[PDB]
Amino acid sequence: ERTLVILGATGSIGTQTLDVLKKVKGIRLIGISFHSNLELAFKIVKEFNVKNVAITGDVEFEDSSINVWKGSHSIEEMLEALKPDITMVAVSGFSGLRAVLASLEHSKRVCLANKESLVCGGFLVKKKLKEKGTELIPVDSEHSAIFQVMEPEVEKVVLTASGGALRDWKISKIDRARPEDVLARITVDSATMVNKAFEVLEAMELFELPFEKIEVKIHREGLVHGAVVLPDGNVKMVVSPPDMRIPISYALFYPRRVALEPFFLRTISLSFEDPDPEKYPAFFLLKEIKDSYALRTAFNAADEVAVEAFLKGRIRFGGIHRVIEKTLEEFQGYPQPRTLDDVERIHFEAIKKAERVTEWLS
Amino acid sequence: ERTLVILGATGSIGTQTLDVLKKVKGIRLIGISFHSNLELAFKIVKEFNVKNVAITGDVEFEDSSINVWKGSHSIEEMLEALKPDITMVAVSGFSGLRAVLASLEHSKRVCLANKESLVCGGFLVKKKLKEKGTELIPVDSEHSAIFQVMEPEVEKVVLTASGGALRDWKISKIDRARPEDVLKMGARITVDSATMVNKAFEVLEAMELFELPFEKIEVKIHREGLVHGAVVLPDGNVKMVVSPPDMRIPISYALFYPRRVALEPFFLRTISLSFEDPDPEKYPAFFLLKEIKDSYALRTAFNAADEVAVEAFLKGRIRFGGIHRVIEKTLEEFQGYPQPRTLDDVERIHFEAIKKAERVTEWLSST
Ligand SMILES: NC(=O)C1=CN([C@@H]2O[C@H](COP(=O)(O)OP(=O)(O)OC[C@H]3O[C@@H](n4cnc5c(N)ncnc54)[C@H](OP(=O)(O)O)[C@@H]3O)[C@@H](O)[C@H]2O)C=CC1
Ligand SMILES: NC(=O)C1=CN([C@@H]2O[C@H](COP(=O)(O)OP(=O)(O)OC[C@H]3O[C@@H](n4cnc5c(N)ncnc54)[C@H](OP(=O)(O)O)[C@@H]3O)[C@@H](O)[C@H]2O)C=CC1
Ligand SMILES: [Mg+2]
Ligand SMILES: [Mg+2]
């Protein structure tokens, strides 16, 4: 009954969304976008009988049987043509900002699983949300949890974090870590807690929260996905298994609850500790960058470069936060971006500077 | 500004409500009821400058400075005169059923802190509710918690229980326990927590308040007493409400809803949360729920038998294990009773059950 477009269908969230569609009825998939993974894309288009494809990268997809949009405006033009009830925005990276803006324009509901859009261009997304009235539901497990318990008056919003792959390591050994010791961008971002820094900025945008009302706790066990501390002593917490199909399903079928597998209650350990500034320096850059979309966009651009460089073996793990920090210095005093073009300009300039810094660090 | 009547103002919930009104602005207390505690009633009247009082016991209240109602209809009379924005119904015992019904007739919101009204006459309350459209918000901390996270497609509604004073006791030792074992909240509530009859009442109240089938309710013993309620969703999500064990929290919530009052925020630390199924051998009276849930006759007799048995325990007439036996045997005498249809039908069952439970209690007391 409800029509769906999945942007970034070939990624993790994209394929987990497909899995949900196999498990629950009522949504018809009518289009996808994907970047370069044609082998998986072909498999999707075959299994789901998808007649509309937007290609965002540099590959071919002939098929006279299906409509194929191609180029820098493929997502936007596909969406205009299809006017889906629901768009799952699961594109990775900075291209997520235009993907989200276009989905808000042409869709009745947007399921948001791209972080860059809010980190770099949250003001643009909020402006478009207000103009269009489109429903927006976060897919991120922590924002999904908060969405389910949020109210207008809160003391604090608590986001939880694993602490990443090196949460147990000594401060002294972390600097030297290799991909082998860490392992995927998301995986590296969890280890530096840059992913958690993105989530704080996203929560500020989604829930109109001041920076001061957000708390991050390392939560070893992975059960509590968010909590809301209220003025009266009450705390509303959300617990679930750590499976992204849960918040995917919630954003897709809201206000209905999909029957998956209930989390029946048993005795549990719930630990909450403050992140160590000496272990997670890039995370603690939040206070420096929060008020500036120029700084936030530069923060994201430098992290993209540094993670890629870390993965390629050009720098050690300790080099990530240093690339970010050094790149941010070069954007101090930048005026607040006002348009999409301003944001895209900062982004590309930040990528250039971060690469220069990465070269120095080796 | 909102006007408030507190029915049962001299009791535990009553005084905790008064404490909230001292800490928080926006609600004016214009009327109280009390049963017999004149000392406390007069000092409430003096400290809150209350001009309106209903007496429900056979007591004298000398005052020309203020309006005083007396006799069997004093609550209904005062409420009809005052028409408060909010009535807190904190009367103890069976007379809460009449009180809640009169409160729904003359208030815009009822804050419900009386269990007998829903246990015994929930069908009567639900009918009056849809007639008037009055708001009813539960004050009980478990129901308050569930109220905060409830949604139509819950898989399970989870109520938590301390397990009460004898929770760590061997089953053989439980039968012979004495008041001193249970009492070292209030006396009745403490016993009911020990037998888990208080939880049986809360399950029945949850079914009424939230329109849940009995099969959708689970009760877990929760040693830490941090989680006050949870809902399990069909998708894997579970929404839990945590707070300090302070009744002022849910009292404030019900009075001020949709506003949250600033009290003391609970900040998160490392916690263990335990959830265990109650042992039917340890809490026999709690597991009578499946037998009584569909009958307001059996639920009224359940409540009445409990009232008699708890008092008899506290008076030293029977040991702790005699409480569930008084309840079980009294219920046996009401097997097959027809479903009550009116307030009057309910009150008749209550009276019969009290008298029948008294006889059983004698029997068990004589051994
Ligand atoms: N993974 C998770 O558990 C979570 C992810 N998110 C957010 O979701 C977003 C995507 O996550 P994830 O699914 O893991 O990422 P993946 O890399 O696993 O997949 C993302 C998709 O985006 C496509 N893509 C890549 N580059 C571009 C581009 N330049 N333009 C348009 N599309 C492109 C990829 O295509 P292809 O494979 O063909 O090259 C793929 O289809 C991120 O912002 C992430 O932070 C949020 C919460 C949880
Ligand atoms: N206490 C708690 O923590 C909780 C209590 N509840 C429920 O709230 C209700 C009352 O609670 P609680 O305040 O603790 O009880 P209390 O015994 O502390 O107070 C009961 C109040 O009702 C009055 N009263 C006594 N008998 C009668 C009667 N026959 N007719 C009219 N009024 C009478 C009493 O007046 P007086 O003092 O003059 O005799 C007193 O003001 C009960 O249903 C209880 O289960 C629910 C959740 C939590
Ligand atoms: Mg997350
Ligand atoms: Mg309770």
Side-chain angles (χ1 to χ4, degrees), chain B residues 64-167:
Chain B
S64 189
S65 291
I66 69 172
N67 304 109
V68 175
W69 283 266
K70 19 79 76 59
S72 75
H73 295 292
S74 58
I75 290 172
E76 18 292 307
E77 297 175 298
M78 176 179 69
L79 283 177
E80 190 198 34
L82 272 49
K83 318 181 183 158
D85 293 325
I86 305 160
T87 304
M88 169 67 76
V89 187
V91 306
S92 61
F94 187 74
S95 82
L97 178 51
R98 290 183 186 185
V100 173
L101 292 177
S103 297
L104 291 170
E105 200 56 43
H106 298 294
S107 321
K108 287 170 191 286
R109 174 183 298 174
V110 171
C111 305
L112 182 61
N114 170 269
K115 306 181 113 46
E116 289 73 13
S117 59
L118 298 176
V119 173
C120 309
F123 68 99
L124 293 173
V125 179
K126 203 96 316 216
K127 187 180 297 102
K128 179 66 78 176
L129 229 25
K130 62 179 69 290
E131 277 196 351
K132 300 306 292 189
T134 308
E135 291 174 35
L136 182 78
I137 305 178
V139 175
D140 181 88
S141 76
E142 303 272 317
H143 301 135
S144 191
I146 297 304
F147 185 96
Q148 287 169 62
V149 291
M150 184 57 190
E151 49 180 277
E153 307 194 273
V154 294
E155 180 98 13
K156 286 292 186 303
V157 167
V158 182
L159 301 175
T160 52
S162 68
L166 309 181
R167 65 192 187 174

Side-chain angles (χ1 to χ4, degrees), chain A residues 60-74:
Chain A
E60 311 315 301
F61 205 93
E62 52 149 290
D63 240 46
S64 54
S65 46
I66 90 323
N67 303 322
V68 184
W69 288 260
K70 184 168 203 314
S72 61
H73 283 53
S74 49

Side-chain angles (χ1 to χ4, degrees), chain A residues 281-305:
Chain A
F283 178 77
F284 283 92
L285 297 159
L286 275 170
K287 187 73 181 143
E288 316 286 49
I289 66 77
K290 62 177 187 92
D291 293 309
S292 165
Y293 290 100
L295 288 186
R296 290 160 53 155
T297 294
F299 177 80
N300 175 69
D303 181 74
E304 180 186 316
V305 174

Side-chain angles (χ1 to χ4, degrees), chain A residues 232 235 239 256-257 260 270, chain B residues 151 153 234 238 242 260 271:
Chain A
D232 61 4
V235 182
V239 173
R256 308 283 323 259
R257 293 284 183 175
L260 295 174
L270 299 188
Chain B
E151 49 180 277
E153 307 194 273
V238 176
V242 164
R260 296 257 182 195
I271 42 188

Side-chain angles (χ1 to χ4, degrees), chain B residues 85-270:
Chain B
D85 293 325
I86 305 160
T87 304
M88 169 67 76
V89 187
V91 306
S92 61
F94 187 74
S95 82
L97 178 51
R98 290 183 186 185
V100 173
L101 292 177
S103 297
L104 291 170
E105 200 56 43
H106 298 294
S107 321
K108 287 170 191 286
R109 174 183 298 174
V110 171
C111 305
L112 182 61
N114 170 269
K115 306 181 113 46
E116 289 73 13
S117 59
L118 298 176
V119 173
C120 309
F123 68 99
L124 293 173
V125 179
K126 203 96 316 216
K127 187 180 297 102
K128 179 66 78 176
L129 229 25
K130 62 179 69 290
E131 277 196 351
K132 300 306 292 189
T134 308
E135 291 174 35
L136 182 78
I137 305 178
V139 175
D140 181 88
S141 76
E142 303 272 317
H143 301 135
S144 191
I146 297 304
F147 185 96
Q148 287 169 62
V149 291
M150 184 57 190
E151 49 180 277
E153 307 194 273
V154 294
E155 180 98 13
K156 286 292 186 303
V157 167
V158 182
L159 301 175
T160 52
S162 68
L166 309 181
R167 65 192 187 174
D168 292 338
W169 281 39
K170 280 159 72 73
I171 299 72
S172 47
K173 295 155 172 186
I174 284 169
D175 181 73
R176 279 181 58 88
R178 283 103 169 156
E180 310 90 271
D181 295 311
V182 169
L183 298 180
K184 208 158 286 293
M185 199 168 271
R188 199 208 167 172
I189 307 79
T190 304
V191 182
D192 280 351
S193 293
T195 52
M196 283 184 66
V197 167
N198 190 252
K199 278 310 138 186
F201 293 153
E202 292 185 347
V203 166
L204 296 173
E205 289 181 288
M207 290 162 56
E208 299 287 345
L209 284 165
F210 311 113
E211 292 176 40
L212 300 153
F214 174 76
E215 297 72 29
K216 284 301 181 50
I217 322 287
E218 257 173 7
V219 172
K220 297 285 171 174
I221 285 169
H222 173 56
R223 188 158 320 267
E224 301 77 21
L226 299 162
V227 175
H228 286 233
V231 303
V232 180
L233 288 319
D235 59 357
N237 281 118
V238 176
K239 294 188 285 180
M240 299 193 326
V241 179
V242 164
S243 89
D246 175 11
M247 271 316 283
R248 291 173 231 182
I249 286 71
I251 281 159
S252 300
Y253 183 90
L255 289 169
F256 289 94
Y257 178 88
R259 161 186 166 188
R260 296 257 182 195
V261 173
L263 301 166
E264 302 292 317
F266 186 96
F267 292 102
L268 297 177
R269 292 154 311 250
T270 294

